[PDB]
Amino acid sequence: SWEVGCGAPVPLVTCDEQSPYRTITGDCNNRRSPALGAANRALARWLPAEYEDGLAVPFGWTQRKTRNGFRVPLAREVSNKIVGYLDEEGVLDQNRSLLFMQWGQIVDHDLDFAPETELGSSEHSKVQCEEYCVQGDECFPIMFPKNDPKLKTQGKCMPFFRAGFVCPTPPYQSLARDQINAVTSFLDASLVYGSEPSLASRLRNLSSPLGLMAVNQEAWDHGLAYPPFNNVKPSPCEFINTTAHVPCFQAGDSRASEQILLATVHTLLLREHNRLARELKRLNPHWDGEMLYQEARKILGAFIQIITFRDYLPIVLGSEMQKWIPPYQGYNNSVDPRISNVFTFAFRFGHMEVPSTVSRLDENYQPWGPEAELPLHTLFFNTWRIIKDGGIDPLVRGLLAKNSKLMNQNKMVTSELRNKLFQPTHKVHGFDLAAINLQRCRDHGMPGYNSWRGFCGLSQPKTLKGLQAVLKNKVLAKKLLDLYKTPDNIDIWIGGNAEPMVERGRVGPLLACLLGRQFQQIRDGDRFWWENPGVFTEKQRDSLQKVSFSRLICDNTHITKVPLHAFQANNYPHDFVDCSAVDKLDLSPWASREN
Numbered sequence: 001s002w003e004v005g006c007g008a009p010v011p012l013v014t015c016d017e018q019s020p021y022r023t024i025t026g027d028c029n030n031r032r033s034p035a036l037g038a039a040n041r042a043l044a045r046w047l048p049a050e051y052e053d054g055l056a057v058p059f060g061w062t063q064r065k066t067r068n069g070f071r072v073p074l075a076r077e078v079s080n081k082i083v084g085y086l087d088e089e090g091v092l093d094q095n096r097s098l099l100f101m102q103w104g105q106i107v108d109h110d111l112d113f114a115p116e117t118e119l120g121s122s123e124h125s126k127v128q129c130e131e132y133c134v135q136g137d138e139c140f141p142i143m144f145p146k147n148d149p150k151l152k153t154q155g156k157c158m159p160f161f162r163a164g165f166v167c168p169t170p171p172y173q174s175l176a177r178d179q180i181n182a183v184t185s186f187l188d189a190s191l192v193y194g195s196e197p198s199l200a201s202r203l204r205n206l207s208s209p210l211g212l213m214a215v216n217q218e219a220w221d222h223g224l225a226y227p228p229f230n231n232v233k234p235s236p237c238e239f240i241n242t243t244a245h246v247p248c249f250q251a252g253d254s255r256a257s258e259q260i261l262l263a264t265v266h267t268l269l270l271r272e273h274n275r276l277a278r279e280l281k282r283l284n285p286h287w288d289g290e291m292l293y294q295e296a297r298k299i300l301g302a303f304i305q306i307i308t309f310r311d312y313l314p315i316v317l318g319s320e321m322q323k324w325i326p327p328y329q330g331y332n333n334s335v336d337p338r339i340s341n342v343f344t345f346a347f348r349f350g351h352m353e354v355p356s357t358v359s360r361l362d363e364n365y366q367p368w369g370p371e372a373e374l375p376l377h378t379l380f381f382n383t384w385r386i387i388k389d390g391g392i393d394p395l396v397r398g399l400l401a402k403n404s405k406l407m408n409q410n411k412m413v414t415s416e417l418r419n420k421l422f423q424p425t426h427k428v429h430g431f432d433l434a435a436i437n438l439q440r441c442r443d444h445g446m447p448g449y450n451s452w453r454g455f456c457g458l459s460q461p462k463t464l465k466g467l468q469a470v471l472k473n474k475v476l477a478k479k480l481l482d483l484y485k486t487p488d489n490i491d492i493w494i495g496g497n498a499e500p501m502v503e504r505g506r507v508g509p510l511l512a513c514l515l516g517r518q519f520q521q522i523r524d525g526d527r528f529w530w531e532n533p534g535v536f537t538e539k540q541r542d543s544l545q546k547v548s549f550s551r552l553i554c555d556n557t558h559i560t561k562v563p564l565h566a567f568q569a570n571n572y573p574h575d576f577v578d579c580s581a582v583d584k585l586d587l588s589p590w591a592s593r594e595n
């Protein structure tokens with residue numbers, strides 16, 4: 001097949017072609033095909049899309065239309081029967097800090113975003129979907145099954161709107177609908193700087209030639225910076241607290257304030273850029289603002305890349321790490337660096353790592369105040385708890401000293417997310433992320449579980465007994481075929497997450513393959529990979545070699561006590577050292593001599 005380049009893409013892109021820095025949009029990374037990995041293009045299709053009409057209509061759209069002879073089960077019913085659980089006791093990951101979960105969200109937000117279609121500014125279908133749960137066009141409501149408690153308290157459905165797609169916004173009819181990735185596929189700190197020129201500029205402080213990112217002028221964190229407020233209304237952060245009237249933050253990625261710990265991590269990264277830009281000024285007084293910004297940006301990008309590939313991915317992929325992401329061999333322009341559609345669901349393994357509560361901890365890493373621990377749901381789009389309740393330091397301590405939730409075949413997604421999710425423009429803490437995920441899978445025309453099993457060279461269970469063996473769980477496999485009459489129909493998100501975890505990892509074989517291939521690609525096909533010869537000097541690379549999330553915390557908060565290995569489960573005071581013991585980023589090799 002179909003047009004090799006479908007329209008509706010801004011075409012005003014010229015490549016500098018010698019520029020030592022990334023573009024904001026990701027264009028110009030690949031010299032032979034400059035659009036590859038650029039934001040606001042179609043997600044890559046590793047396999048042909050599968051829609052009930054072969055083109056755009058999701059499986060589950062037409063009641064009579066089956067998938068492989070069987071009706072697909074309601075997303076909310078799969079959620080109720082499989083994904084939910086009551087007892088939060090014993091669910092915590094004994095050897096992963098809460099930061100392990102949080103870094104996952106960060107890296108996802110750097111890589112992909114498929115926003116809901118708009119097409120209704122004065123839109124009343126925004127209410128026709130909300131109010132009356134009537135399916136049509138981009139309204140694809142998540143209907144409650146019979147016996148669902150939400151049917152008694154929340155009406156007939158949860159509203160759900162189909163993801164935006166390429167070229168025209170209005171549906172096309174000859175080639176399979178392609179969803180948009182609104183951010184750059186390259187791991188390049190686009191969640192900090194934006195993926196659009198329009199946003200990247202607003203985020204910058206262009207009042208002073210210091211190459212700084214703009215900061216909050218209203219509020220301060222004991223002399224430390226907050227991100228600026230997004231002053232546009234209606235704002236969901238103001239909504240969740242009428243009295244507080246504290247807006248969401250404004251970051252390079254719009255999702256930054258979805259939960260307090262994500263906002264917290266965005267705060268750390270913004271602080272890091274300004275910290276870096278200041279040092280780069282001392283070393284190079286002659287560098288103008290643009291050079292400073294670009295050079296600090298480039299450093300942070302390297303930081304994110306190294307933390308992700310050196311510290312994070314090995315403890316996600318475990319034994320599969322080396323199988324899918326071998327040691328680096330240089331840049332390869334034949335590699336497609338685009339995030340695939342399926343990856344955006346594969347990376348949602350993180351949803352089962354999120355615990356039910358968030359804690360604030362004082363300087364002895366003990367409960368900060370009388371309500372130190374809070375239910376996760378009271379922290380969706382919550383910025384006031386940061387500004388009016390002790391800044392980000394007590395939250396960072398929690399990130400270090402508390403555990404991620406462990407994925408559990410019996411206890412998949414906490415009810416803080418599965419029953420009490422809050423969504424913007426929507427008013428209640430009554431949504432289901434798991435149901436959303438499944439509905440979204442179908443929205444995006446995902447091939448089924450077995451198609452992806454085949455993709456990864458894995459066996460394709462056809463019977464209850466084959467599925468029991470694959471999952472090593474009789475009860476779970478029974479529930480899955482009871483709902484999906486065949487493992488061919490099992491939505492990839494639940495299928496992949498249902499598999500037991502690989503040795504030393506936190507995902508199954510199917511996911512490790514989908515994640516592994518993707519991360520291998522975003523590295524190998526990134527012309528500005530930090531370790532690609534020429535991007536940095538060798539001396540610079542030696543300096544970057546010693547970055548640590550521990551150091552990031554020390555440099556950018558008033559925390560003085562940190563663990564060496566921030567992602568493993570660390571207990572205070574034993575596993576914690578003084579910041580003085582922690583390697584620092586030696587910026588001296590960035591000194592640029594004139595004469």
Ligand code: HEM
Nearest residue numbers: 101104105108112113114259344347348350351354436440
């Ligand atoms: C409390 C923490 C989290 C919350 C509240 C949250 C919430 C959400 C919501 C509401 C969506 C949009 C779903 C849709 O409309 O289709 C989403 C998408 C997503 N989530 Fe999370 N999430 C959290 C943590 C994580 C983590 C830890 C990871 C990975 C480690 C992750 C990975 C993803 C990915 C890949 C998407 C799709 C992004 C895209 O559009 O490409 N999330 N999440």
Ligand SMILES: *[C@@H]1O[C@H](CO)[C@@H](O[C@@H]2O[C@H](CO)[C@@H](O)[C@H](O)[C@H]2NC(C)=O)[C@H](O)[C@H]1NC(C)=O
Nearest residue numbers: 204205206207208210212213214215216217228
């Ligand atoms: C943009 O940068 C300028 C210059 O750093 C900021 O203005 C200064 O603000 C500081 C607070 O850090 C005040 O104490 C001074 O009056 C200013 N200092 C100097 C040396 O001029 C300004 O706040 C920044 N604007 C934004 C939106 O971040």
Ligand SMILES: *[C@@H]1O[C@H](CO)[C@@H](O[C@@H]2O[C@H](CO)[C@@H](O)[C@H](O)[C@H]2NC(C)=O)[C@H](O)[C@H]1NC(C)=O
Nearest residue numbers: 240241242243244245378382384385387388389
């Ligand atoms: C919304 O935010 C306000 C403002 O911080 C919260 O009010 C604080 O809560 C307790 C009283 O219950 C006190 O410790 C603070 O001094 C209060 N401040 C003010 C100005 O009242 C309030 O609890 C929040 N409400 C919700 C629903 O989140």
Ligand SMILES: *[C@@H]1O[C@H](CO)[C@@H](O)[C@H](O)[C@H]1NC(C)=O
Nearest residue numbers: 095096314315565567568569
């Ligand atoms: C805890 O995790 C790290 C890897 O993050 C590993 O080196 C260590 O052996 C783990 N401990 C156990 C008991 O599995």
Ligand SMILES: *[C@@H]1O[C@H](CO)[C@@H](O)[C@H](O)[C@H]1NC(C)=O
Nearest residue numbers: 329331332333334335336524
């Ligand atoms: C470069 O990428 C192509 C396409 O993915 C791959 O087939 C090839 O083996 C890679 N080159 C090297 C030297 O690994």
Ligand SMILES: NC(=O)c1cnccn1
Nearest residue numbers: 105106108109255258259
């Ligand atoms: N973690 C996420 O991918 C996410 C968080 N908040 C809104 C949308 N997506």
Ligand SMILES: NC(=O)c1cnccn1
Nearest residue numbers: 254255256257258423424
């Ligand atoms: N889906 C979300 O939770 C979200 C949060 N903030 C901006 C946009 N989307």
Ligand SMILES: [Ca+2]
Nearest residue numbers: 110184186190
């Ligand atoms: Ca990116």
Ligand SMILES: [Zn+2]
Nearest residue numbers: 221222223558
């Ligand atoms: Zn302080």
